[PDB]
Amino acid sequence: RGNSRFAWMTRKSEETITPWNFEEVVDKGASAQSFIERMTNFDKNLPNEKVLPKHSLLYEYFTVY
DNA sequence: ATGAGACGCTGGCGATTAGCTAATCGCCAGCGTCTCATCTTTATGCGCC
């Protein structure tokens, strides 16, 4: 509940998360999203901008060209 | 019109009585796993201001 430097999970509500209301209190979408975005790097040329996935068709066209 | 001033075995034993770190070495050290993802980075391979 905002007291750990290792957490990223977002609470839809603000209750003590139990195995029955786990699906409702925890935003599984935003938790997985924040989980992966916190590990991916940023573009060295464009610092504040993120990076496209490895299977992007535009990115394959880029490396091919 | 007299009655104070002058003070010991200790030292050298035993024998209680009491009490304390230190030097040497040996032992022996919580550890087991998996999942999941995440990023890097390296070996080789390709380009001239």
Swiss-Prot record:
Knockout: what is the outcome?
Answer: Loss of correct processing of pre-crRNA and tracrRNA. Loss of immunity against a plasmid with homology to CRISPR spacer sequences.
What domain of life does the native source organism fall in? Bacteria
Q: How is it used?
A: Coexpression of Cas9 with an artificial single guide RNA (sgRNA) which fuses the crRNA with the tracrRNA in human cells has shown it is possible to target and modify DNA sequences of interest. Cas9 plus the 2 sgRNAs have also been expressed individually in human and mouse cells to achieve DNA targeting; cleavage efficiencies of the artificial sgRNA were lower that those for systems with the 2 sgRNAs expressed separately. Microinjection of Cas9-encoding mRNA and a synthetic sgRNA into zebrafish embryos induces targeted mutations.
The UniProt similarity line reads: Belongs to the CRISPR-associated protein Cas9 family. Subtype II-A subfamily.
The UniProt subunit note reads as follows: Monomer. Binds crRNA and tracrRNA.
Its job: CRISPR (clustered regularly interspaced short palindromic repeat) is an adaptive immune system that provides protection against mobile genetic elements (viruses, transposable elements and conjugative plasmids). CRISPR clusters contain spacers, sequences complementary to antecedent mobile elements, and target invading nucleic acids. CRISPR clusters are transcribed and processed into CRISPR RNA (crRNA). In type II CRISPR systems correct processing of pre-crRNA requires a trans-encoded small RNA (tracrRNA), endogenous ribonuclease 3 (rnc) and this protein.
Q: What is known of its domains?
A: Has 2 endonuclease domains. The discontinuous RuvC-like domain (approximately residues 1-62, 718-765 and 925-1102) recognizes and cleaves the target DNA noncomplementary to crRNA while the HNH nuclease domain (residues 810-872) cleaves the target DNA complementary to crRNA. Has a bilobed architecture with a recognition lobe (REC, residues 60-718) and a discontinuous nuclease lobe (NUC, residues 1-59 and 719-1368). The crRNA-target DNA lies in a channel between the 2 lobes. Binding of sgRNA induces large conformational changes further enhanced by target DNA binding. REC recognizes and binds differing regions of an artificial sgRNA in a sequence-independent manner. Deletions of parts of this lobe abolish nuclease activity.
The name this protein carries in UniProt is CRISPR-associated endonuclease Cas9/Csn1
This chain's source organism reads Streptococcus pyogenes serotype M1
Q: Which residues of the full protein are shown?
A: 457 to 521 of 1368
